[PDB]
Amino acid sequence: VVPTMLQDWYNSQGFIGYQACAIISQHWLVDKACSMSGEDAARNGWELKSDGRKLSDEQSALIARRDMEFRVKDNLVELNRFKNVFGVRIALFVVESDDPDYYEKPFNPDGITPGSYKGISQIDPYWAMPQLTAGSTADPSSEHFYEPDFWIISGKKYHRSHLVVVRGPQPPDILKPTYIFGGIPLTQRIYERVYAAERTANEAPLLAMSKRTSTIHVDVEKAIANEDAFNARLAFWIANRDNHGVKVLGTDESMEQFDTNLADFDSIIMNQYQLVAAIAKTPATKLLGTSPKGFNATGEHETISYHEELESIQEHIFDPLLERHYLLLAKSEEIDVQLEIVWNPVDSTSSQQQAELNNKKAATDEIYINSGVVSPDEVRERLRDDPRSGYNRLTDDQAETEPGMSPENLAEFEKAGAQSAKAKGEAERAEAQAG
Amino acid sequence: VVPTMLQDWYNSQGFIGYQACAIISQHWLVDKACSMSGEDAARNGWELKSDGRKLSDEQSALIARRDMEFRVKDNLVELNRFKNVFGVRIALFVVESDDPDYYEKPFNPDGITPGSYKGISQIDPYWAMPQLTAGSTADPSSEHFYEPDFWIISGKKYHRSHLVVVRGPQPPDILKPTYIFGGIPLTQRIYERVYAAERTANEAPLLAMSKRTSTIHVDVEKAIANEDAFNARLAFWIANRDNHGVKVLGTDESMEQFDTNLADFDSIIMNQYQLVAAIAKTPATKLLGTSPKGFNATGEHETISYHEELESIQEHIFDPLLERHYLLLAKSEEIDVQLEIVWNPVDSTSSQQQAELNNKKAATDEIYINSGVVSPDEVRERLRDDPRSGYNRLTDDQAETEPGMSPENLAEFEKAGAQSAKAKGEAERAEAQAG
């Protein structure tokens, strides 16, 4: 069985509250930890793919205009940030309909009334109130068990399907209502470790101020009698204290001196900041600005652990938001073909590395074209629909489109075919003259 | 539940105030932290593309003249700097209209009266006053909840859409009014860490001044009788103190000496400066001039964490300003096509690295042209509209524009087709003679 001390040590990590989370979020370290996690994932942006190869130019211009008027980038960045701050975040796609009870029925893609998608809003948890139906609470076997069917925001109750909910680590069922059916907040995860790190960082300067504590053993009952000339003389000493002046003090007087050793505070401070980074799932290079004291220099393992793992998780968190946004944008406006989202690579590599990447990819393209695998048209389309490739602005023209020809093998094929015709004709002449 | 001590330790990080921010901003550390963040992002500048290939030269010259008269670079640099200093900055695009209530209606791109865009101004937060409407305060579900609809600057109330607002980390809703609906100021983030770092930097010289504290134990009740010849003798000793003369002092006198150990102050100082860099999200190489003591040498991870992440954040902060500026600079004047801004890469790499970059890109260009992917015209246009590429003055002529010919494959194609004509004619002659 679990011991009582370990049991109530673990049980005391309870939910702290939305007010406490908002109050603690003012601190720089928790703000940074909740901020530069999905912001880096959202940095490189996305690209539109659709069933067709290239979207129509007017369609792309309209999509860009609507995205800029809706502020999608800032929206999902704030979504991730406050989802990390609090336990959960709610994104409501505002859309206009004639029926006052529109946000009561389950969300239907047919209920459009075109030209009605006005934008999105993000509601903090204390402004909302999850509502459980009896069908969503009675049956553990139900796939919507302990999943809020409705959310009372301002009097009215928005249905679950209408809005998009992003939540934290999803605590177990028995204590899911204790988190108001949200998630475990990163503020609750790091309001203690951050405080310990900051206070240890505080203690070294403050103790260094009172490092040296030189004291003098004066006959105090003799200083009692005057105590004005005595204080004046010692104030003069303290004012003109120097490493060349000499202090005269009588017999039966010691004047000892003590000092503190502060060499071991740095290890404690950086050990706590490393744990801040550990809880934040973000490298200490990103949070602290560099690797902490004595730790091994950050490497390929940490770069793939951060740039690839956590950013892909944040991108799959963003994906419901972008998917519903593009549904309610495309289908609501006059379109013909549905839309889908491709995520740009998030490596943020330097210019030299980007050039090396482009050169190696060009070598692969040349090898494939020369071997006759892919036509240059595919390479043209890849360069056009590939940012950071050097050429995002080429033309509207078309390449050969024949499966891996290139001018070299085009000339070779024409010359070989004509020479083959010549040789077959000369062979037929040889048959005729030999016969 | 959060404890009382941790709770009121976190609650104490309140909003210091605009006066406090302005007063603290005089310090060098906070000024540098707020300065060299978006200034580096703005250094490399931008380029203009529009829907067309190249803007007409008269239009480009007019745009350059207007940008120089409006000092756009300096304004956006100051915008980022004081946005970091205070919690929020307001940029108002001044424009003239007949209606004295012009800055009351929501901003409309049609309300131009051409030749009226006179420039931009930046209003400090204490000169402004946000105003919230009942529609912007009653509904948490509203998209503009807790977003000031109007800003009283000088009596009159400018609408939100008319002006561009850049704000800090956007505190949560319950304490958003406590920041006057702005952002969390970087001065509030670093007025204590900066003080601790500077005071620790002060302590080591000041204490090193009073490092040695040699004292002499003379019978003071004997010195008291004369105390003038005694003072003169000791003053003579202190004046002619040297490591060769000898000091005579009678029996029952000790003359001990104390000294302080200061080898551990450097660790504290360079830990606190590293923490200041951590707050500023700026490398210690940029702030302190070099990596601090002991810490691993700054590398590729920190360069991609600063040059790519934070500077792109500053660029997307700048983007509303440039977008509105070009809206009211293009459409206000006589133009035909809208404008779009592209951002130069911000790496500031050395000349040798730039040459290697250009050489590798030229290798990619040669590979693609030889394989028949891209025509040399695209490479010419890229070089023309690519700064730091060596060629930015070339000529106004055109390349082949056929997709990937080059003179080599042009001559090869002509010769191959001609030899094909040869071989096919000889084949026809061979069949004619064989028949």
Side-chain angles (χ1 to χ4, degrees), chain A residues 67-349:
Chain A
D67 274 8
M68 282 296 268
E69 291 196 62
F70 293 160
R71 311 152 43 242
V72 175
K73 294 282 321 293
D74 304 50
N75 265 306
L76 37 93
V77 166
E78 187 202 321
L79 188 98
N80 161 78
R81 185 173 114 70
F82 279 101
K83 161 261 173 177
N84 269 346
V85 170
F86 296 100
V88 67
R89 197 142 179 84
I90 319 185
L92 151 65
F93 300 79
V94 317
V95 69
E96 301 266 6
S97 147
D98 67 327
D99 165 35
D101 303 68
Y102 170 57
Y103 286 121
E104 297 297 285
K105 309 172 256 278
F107 166 84
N108 201 44
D110 321 329
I112 292 301
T113 72
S116 182
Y117 185 33
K118 299 292 115 182
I120 79 186
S121 159
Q122 282 139 28
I123 301 103
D124 272 327
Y126 34 65
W127 296 126
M129 245 177 227
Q131 190 88 4
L132 292 210
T133 75
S136 158
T137 322
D139 220 338
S141 158
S142 165
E143 85 199 26
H144 316 301
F145 178 84
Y146 273 25
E147 181 96 339
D149 278 25
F150 285 88
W151 297 81
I152 284 82
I153 304 195
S154 37
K156 71 215 305 302
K157 48 195 258 152
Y158 299 75
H159 188 248
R160 147 168 63 73
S161 56
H162 264 313
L163 42 80
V164 156
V165 174
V166 287
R167 52 222 307 152
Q170 204 71 352
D173 285 44
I174 52 151
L175 55 95
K176 213 184 300 306
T178 69
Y179 286 90
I180 316 311
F181 306 102
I184 308 170
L186 193 63
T187 293
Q188 187 223 2
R189 282 156 181 270
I190 358 177
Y191 74 100
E192 291 156 350
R193 167 67 56 243
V194 165
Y195 164 81
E198 283 270 69
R199 265 295 295 153
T200 39
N202 268 346
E203 208 67 20
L206 162 57
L207 200 60
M209 297 296 89
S210 45
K211 167 185 267 274
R212 177 233 280 158
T213 51
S214 45
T215 63
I216 178 166
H217 273 89
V218 152
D219 184 318
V220 165
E221 86 182 49
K222 274 199 303 208
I224 281 280
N226 315 321
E227 171 205 49
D228 40 300
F230 178 59
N231 283 287
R233 225 140 54 221
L234 288 200
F236 169 68
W237 171 32
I238 297 307
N240 316 60
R241 219 178 150 173
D242 176 291
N243 54 27
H244 278 270
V246 74
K247 170 78 187 144
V248 163
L249 72 173
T251 63
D252 320 59
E253 289 198 298
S254 48
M255 212 276 288
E256 53 241 61
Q257 171 164 307
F258 311 86
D259 53 34
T260 320
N261 207 355
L262 316 170
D264 51 57
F265 260 109
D266 49 34
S267 310
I268 310 178
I269 293 158
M270 312 316 253
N271 268 23
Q272 300 293 322
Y273 275 95
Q274 173 50 233
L275 286 179
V276 179
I279 291 147
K281 316 189 71 134
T282 305
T285 318
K286 309 287 298 213
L287 273 146
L288 186 56
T290 181
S291 165
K293 274 321 310 173
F295 285 92
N296 301 276
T298 36
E300 278 66 16
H301 323 297
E302 275 174 77
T303 57
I304 64 180
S305 296
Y306 177 56
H307 278 325
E308 269 66 18
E309 315 313 302
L310 189 72
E311 321 285 20
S312 304
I313 294 324
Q314 303 294 340
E315 270 160 15
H316 102 290
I317 281 291
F318 291 156
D319 270 317
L321 196 83
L322 284 174
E323 276 149 16
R324 184 132 303 195
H325 161 44
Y326 285 176
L327 186 44
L328 262 48
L329 186 66
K331 149 63 134 159
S332 85
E333 309 326 296
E334 273 64 54
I335 64 107
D336 289 346
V337 62
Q338 63 138 296
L339 250 54
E340 76 91 359
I341 317 97
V342 74
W343 279 113
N344 265 352
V346 53
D347 312 307
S348 281
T349 206

Side-chain angles (χ1 to χ4, degrees), chain B residues 15 18 88 125 128-130 148 151 167 175-183:
Chain B
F15 175 54
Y18 295 131
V88 53
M129 221 185 268
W151 298 83
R167 54 226 300 150
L175 48 74
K176 213 187 300 305
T178 67
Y179 287 89
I180 319 305
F181 307 100

